[PDB]
Design an enzyme around this catalytic site. Structure first.
Site, PDB file in Angstrom:
ATOM      1  N   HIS B  41     -34.720  25.027  14.957  1.00 14.37           N
ATOM      2  CA  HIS B  41     -34.256  26.450  14.741  1.00 14.37           C
ATOM      3  C   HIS B  41     -34.412  26.928  13.405  1.00 14.37           C
ATOM      4  CE1 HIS B  41     -29.814  25.116  14.856  1.00 14.37           C
ATOM      5  NE2 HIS B  41     -29.956  26.167  13.786  1.00 14.37           N
ATOM      6  N   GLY B 143     -24.738  26.771   8.495  1.00  9.46           N
ATOM      7  CA  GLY B 143     -25.439  25.694   7.414  1.00  9.46           C
ATOM      8  C   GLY B 143     -25.177  24.472   8.133  1.00  9.46           C
ATOM      9  N   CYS B 145     -25.855  22.963  10.687  1.00 10.66           N
ATOM     10  CA  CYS B 145     -26.663  22.513  11.682  1.00 10.66           C
ATOM     11  C   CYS B 145     -27.580  21.150  10.751  1.00 10.66           C
ATOM     12  CB  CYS B 145     -27.660  23.447  11.967  1.00 10.66           C
ATOM     13  SG  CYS B 145     -26.908  24.241  13.452  1.00 10.66           S
TER      14      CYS B 145
HETATM   15  C1  LIG Z   1     -26.430  25.807  12.577  1.00  9.18           C
HETATM   16  O1  LIG Z   1     -26.090  25.796  10.916  1.00  9.18           O
HETATM   17  C2  LIG Z   1     -25.567  26.831  13.181  1.00  9.18           C
HETATM   18  C3  LIG Z   1     -24.158  26.059  13.487  1.00  9.18           C
HETATM   19  C4  LIG Z   1     -23.137  27.186  14.177  1.00  9.18           C
HETATM   20  C5  LIG Z   1     -23.122  28.433  12.845  1.00  9.18           C
HETATM   21  C6  LIG Z   1     -21.593  28.707  13.016  1.00  9.18           C
HETATM   22  N1  LIG Z   1     -20.868  27.324  13.415  1.00  9.18           N
HETATM   23  C7  LIG Z   1     -21.917  26.432  14.236  1.00  9.18           C
HETATM   24  O2  LIG Z   1     -21.755  25.461  14.654  1.00  9.18           O
HETATM   25  N2  LIG Z   1     -26.162  26.833  14.661  1.00  9.18           N
HETATM   26  C8  LIG Z   1     -26.649  28.331  15.203  1.00  9.18           C
HETATM   27  O3  LIG Z   1     -26.262  29.091  14.429  1.00  9.18           O
HETATM   28  C9  LIG Z   1     -27.030  28.647  16.260  1.00  9.18           C
HETATM   29  C10 LIG Z   1     -28.558  29.089  16.091  1.00  9.18           C
HETATM   30  C11 LIG Z   1     -29.293  28.868  17.583  1.00  9.18           C
HETATM   31  C12 LIG Z   1     -30.780  29.297  17.339  1.00  9.18           C
HETATM   32  C13 LIG Z   1     -29.568  27.341  17.802  1.00  9.18           C
HETATM   33  N3  LIG Z   1     -26.360  29.563  16.937  1.00  9.18           N
HETATM   34  C14 LIG Z   1     -24.970  29.590  17.297  1.00  9.18           C
HETATM   35  O4  LIG Z   1     -24.564  28.473  17.339  1.00  9.18           O
HETATM   36  O5  LIG Z   1     -24.359  30.607  17.659  1.00  9.18           O
HETATM   37  C15 LIG Z   1     -23.045  30.743  17.731  1.00  9.18           C
HETATM   38  C16 LIG Z   1     -22.419  31.167  16.289  1.00  9.18           C
HETATM   39  C17 LIG Z   1     -21.130  31.201  16.066  1.00  9.18           C
HETATM   40  C18 LIG Z   1     -20.503  31.621  14.897  1.00  9.18           C
HETATM   41  C19 LIG Z   1     -21.455  31.664  13.806  1.00  9.18           C
HETATM   42  C20 LIG Z   1     -22.707  31.835  14.160  1.00  9.18           C
HETATM   43  C21 LIG Z   1     -23.265  31.537  15.266  1.00  9.18           C
END
Ligand SMILES: *[C@H](O)[C@H](C[C@@H]1CCNC1=O)NC(=O)[C@H](CC(C)C)NC(=O)OCc1ccccc1
Ligand SMILES: *[C@H](O)[C@H](C[C@@H]1CCNC1=O)NC(=O)[C@H](CC(C)C)NC(=O)OCc1ccccc1
Lengths: 306, 306
Positions: B41, B143, B145
């Site tokens: 992603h 960030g 990820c």
């Molecule tokens: C990757 O950096 C990110 C890790 C999330 C961001 C905040 N805490 C985490 O574990 N993963 C994502 O943003 C993911 C994107 C999808 C296309 C896989 N979406 C996600 O995890 O949604 C939940 C979320 C919660 C709080 C803030 C942002 C997203």
């Protein structure tokens, strides 16, 4: 989101761990530039540890009685001295991996990462706090001595702890890297008391703030309190008195959250007087005090390298 | 003595963390030999994450749209593919620091260390368990990820986890390093349920054994029980059924301690039915299940490197 007991990345300090052997005893030593720091009781034998005359034992020792090796590479020792409870072994080779480093004497309530080693090789990292009574609640088996505690800032390793001994209570005691013990301890196999251990109030609040930041808000009250009235509550429960620079240190957390510090103290007073009623805060049924305000901010902000 | 949530030394995996940027999104990537693994992603934009057609987004991408750098050194990308939910970026340079490594799909109840990174730089290590429901209770900001989970055996890094997303419950989900999610998850910004999370019974027992080893013996009963009768108790309390290879895995701990496994289960049944009555076990007021039997043995034995 999420909050964990996070240690620093250990790679910088890994490349500094060596094995130091003197007769039958093997300990870990810290190889920085061309000197190897290690607990001076490496020079003790089976019997000597009841009450060692360390200067008298060190005199029986010459440079060649000190086997130090980094992995397989044996380093030649070109000088030895005793600084407080630490042996300084001058070696001919500067460690090609010494990082930018400082020696610091950390203060009670501060935290640091411990890299637990055996035979000069690292086995694990965990985070712990210098308790108010100058002990640490560690995990240290025999041979762990010379394992070090540290912080990272930018690329700068700040070494603050070297492990020496286990007390009767099972907590751990050790020195700064100039060989001065934290606390009233001496490096003898004798029964030694630490004081009563108090709870680090400013850390508990910082952890309550991390809890609010992470969605745990059930403990939030409709009450407030005063420094003095809370501080009477703190003394009932062996909590260190909360002071005005403590509320100021919590300032960033108070502002990032919109919860006044004394509203948080009043929440903490209720937890202390009524317990948790079988609830949990950040996956814990106890009040946690091994997170400083900076730990919380660094974790709730994602500060890197450090 | 002492028992701590210990992570593996992170030095080997530190030298493998890079920054991967694709448009505005920056993630962490794992640089092993001449390939960089990162969550697919990274190729998503602001809007695409509601329901991305990943193959259709990857087609709009060429090798030069992938900025990967290790510290300051930018690596040239000579190939890209998508394996399940992971992007594999071929780079011209083999990492001079790739350790001996395996990719493994760990099983539920197993633990691993997480090196939480931002912008290709490490910020902390903590230990956690693959829950029975295939989530992890991590600490991951935006960030994070591409941060990876791993074990060490001798000099061999076993990578088992790459972080992708946070669920509504605030737990975390991710893939093995072949890009297959642990659990029923997909990498979309959609509401996704994990199942009920059960407690890892064999881990709780291993932690009861570590507790006995470390002097905490108040919970030891005068009772015994049977696999089936305990397993009826386990199901009441969302504990995974205890099985015969579970008691066999606890064998070393049972022998090193002289406490039969079913005597320990009967102790655990009492804790489950009567709570802890405000006592603590190894500094915790909850039953801990993120220590496997090997974690306990390794910690209570001091196994190094690993
Ligand atoms: C990757 O950096 C990110 C890790 C999330 C961001 C905040 N805490 C985490 O574990 N993963 C994502 O943003 C993911 C994107 C999808 C296309 C896989 N979406 C996600 O995890 O949604 C939940 C979320 C919660 C709080 C803030 C942002 C997203
Ligand atoms: C250094 O390797 C060792 C660390 C102890 C050993 C077991 N757990 C530890 O933290 N320190 C000592 O052995 C120390 C020697 C004195 C001369 C400083 N003595 C000590 O800590 O006594 C307590 C003890 C408890 C359990 C086993 C052995 C010693």
């Amino acid at each position: 989101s999420g909050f964990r007991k996070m240690a620093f990345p250990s790679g910088k300090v890994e490349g500094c761990m060596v094995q130091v052997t003197c007769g039958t005893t093997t300990l870990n030593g810290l190889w920085l530039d061309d000197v190897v720091y290690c607990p001076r009781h490496v020079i003790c034998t089976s019997e000597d540890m009841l009450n060692p005359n360390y200067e008298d034992l060190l005199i029986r020792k010459s440079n060649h009685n000190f086997l130090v090796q980094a992995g397989n590479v044996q380093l030649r020792v070109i000088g030895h001295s005793m600084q407080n409870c630490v042996l300084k072994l001058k070696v001919d080779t500067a460690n090609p991996k010494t990082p930018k480093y400082k020696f610091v004497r950390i203060q009670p309530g501060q935290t640091f990462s411990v890299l637990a080693c055996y035979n000069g090789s690292p086995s694990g990292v965990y985070q712990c706090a210098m308790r108010p009574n100058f002990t640490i609640k560690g995990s240290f088996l025999n041979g762990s001595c010379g394992s070090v505690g540290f912080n990272i800032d930018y690329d700068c390793v700040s070494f603050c702890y070297m492990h020496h001994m286990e007390l009767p209570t099972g907590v751990h005691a050790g020195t700064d890297l100039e060989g001065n013990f934290y606390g009233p301890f001496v490096d003898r196999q004798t029964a030694q008391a630490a004081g009563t251990d108090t709870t680090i109030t400013v850390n508990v609040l910082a952890w309550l703030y991390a809890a609010v930041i992470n969605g745990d808000r059930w403990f939030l009250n409709r009450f407030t309190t005063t420094l003095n009235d809370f501080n009477l509550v703190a003394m009932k429960y062996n909590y260190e008195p909360l002071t005005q620079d403590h509320v100021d240190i919590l300032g960033p957390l108070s502002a990032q959250t919109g919860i006044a510090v004394l509203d948080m103290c009043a929440s903490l007073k209720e937890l202390l007087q009524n317990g948790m009623n079988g609830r949990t805060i950040l996956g814990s049924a106890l009040l946690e005090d091994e997170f400083t305000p900076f730990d919380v901010v660094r974790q709730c902000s994602g500060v890197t390298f450090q």
